[model samples]
Target: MTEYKLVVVGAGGVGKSALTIQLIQNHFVDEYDPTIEDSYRKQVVIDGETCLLDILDTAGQAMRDQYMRTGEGFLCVFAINNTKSFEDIHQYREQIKRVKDSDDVPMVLVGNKCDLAARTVESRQAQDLARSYGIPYIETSAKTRQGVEDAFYTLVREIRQH
Candidate 1:
């Protein structure tokens, strides 16, 4: 089994932790136990491969670059209902650029909270952002397990090809 570092990153309260818990535990909690400065970890098996996911569930907007530097790749998330966070790609582009430099490392863009699509910021907008950044995109709802696993699975699949 291959051990890999999977970093889940995004603006706070965007369900980064929820998605992580659901992916590993197969359940959700209305409230998550808070951790210091945005960090957590869990191990999971995808396609029979075990991976050590070093989660970086960030808080506030300023810590993105620091977290991005902590792992080999990133699953950058944004709440589908929160347009501002979806817009954060522009602000954090420099940070991502500094670490991965485009395709050197895989960075997956996740549009979270699809269960609340009535409040979605527009799926196409999120897709456009991912395309503009040359990253793959998926809309996930941690609440419903939609596309949650794919966020990590897709990245791992891509990594294996390299």
Candidate 2:
């Protein structure tokens, strides 16, 4: 079977784990708990094609090197509810490039937790980030299942084309 490896990355509490939970299980956590583990892997299909989606959910906000060592591309997620996370996009991009060692790796900038826009960090931050990176951007809420599937499928389509 053909396989595609993808990583979901972001700071703690930015809904990285939440997005993973929803995308793989179609459910969200009712309780917010700190991630105890560093990595979570799941296998799922996109467009009826099987894929091995390995998520490197890190902590402490400085372990980007550890996660990037996985040598796979990434899906960068930020919480619309957290302005700091959204603003950290530049740093995240630099770290991803340094770790992956290639600018060719595909990534999709994901704005998670859209269901709580009332608590948003900064409106339109994700849009501006996408424009700067020249990549596709998506706003998702794992609780409502909005834009959850689209984020992954959109990345898959882009990968196939390039």
Candidate 3:
């Protein structure tokens, strides 16, 4: 089976862990807890191919720039309700490119917590940022499982192509 290493990154309370856990366990977590760092491994089938996916779920407070270079792909996530978190994607992407020394790094910009209607960041604005970076943008709700699987699968496909 092919092996893919991915990192899920974002500020605290932005649903990075929620999305990773939901994708790995097929369930949603109700409680909000801070995570320093967590790792998950799962066997997933994407596009008729079985693959081993290893994910590093991280809190923005303690993200090591060196780790950013190790990932084959990334999910740069932000809570739709937090505009500051949305704005931090630029820093995250910059750090990744600086560490990897490649502007063509595979990654997806994810707007999480879409179940909440009171969003601070507009979807169009997020899409425009993603377009500027030449990456795919997706909105997901871990609670509702909306677009959750698509985000991961899309990243995996991008990794394979790269």
Candidate 4:
């Protein structure tokens, strides 16, 4: 069996754990339980191949270099309704590249909170940012669970190709 190591990184309030739990636990956690850091594992089929996902839900945490070195892929999440959240992706991306010691890595630019009624960052802006990085972009909503798996599975696929 193949194993995919993935990391979820984003600013606070960007729903990093929300999306991670939705993928690993299969539901939206409504409680306000703050996170330090958590690791999860799950088995599933991707493109007809069985695999296991090693996920790191990084909320309220730091020391990025350690996990950054071990993580095989990353989901750089940004809140659609928060302008400042979108800017955090660059920091995470640069850290990942630096830690991995490579210019190219398996990463996805995820725009979360698409289900919200208000949005500060336009969809095209995210798309443009992702294109310049040569990575895929996926918009997701933890509330609706839409486009959630798309982000995780897409990252695994990118890892496979890497």
TM-score of each: 0.82, 0.83, 0.96, 0.96
| C-alpha lDDT of residue 118 in model 1 | 62
Clashing pairs in 2: none
C-alpha positional error of residue 32 in candidate 2 after TM-score superposition, expressed in Å: 2.4
Tens digits of per-residue lDDT, candidate 4, 21-136, equal 89877899877777788999898998899999899988744487888899999999999999989997898898888888999999999999999989999999999999999999
| Model 1 Cα lDDT, one tens digit per residue, 19-42 | 877876799768756545555566
**Cα lDDT, model 4, residue 5:** 92
| Candidate 3 residue lDDT tens string, 65-131 | 8678788899999999999999888888888888899989999999999999799999999999999
Number of the top candidate by lDDT? 4
| Models sorted by TM-score, best on top | 4, 3, 2, 1
TM-score of 3: 0.96
| Candidate 1 error regions (>4 Å) | 32-43, 61-66, 100-104
Give the per-residue Cα lDDT of candidate 2 at 121: 61
Q: Which ten residues in a row have the lowest lDDT in candidate 2?
A: 55-64
lDDT of 2 by residue, 1-162 (tens): 645556676777887777777877778877868775555566667678777665555552555577566635567888887778877777878888877777666788988888884666654666776878878889888889899889877876776766
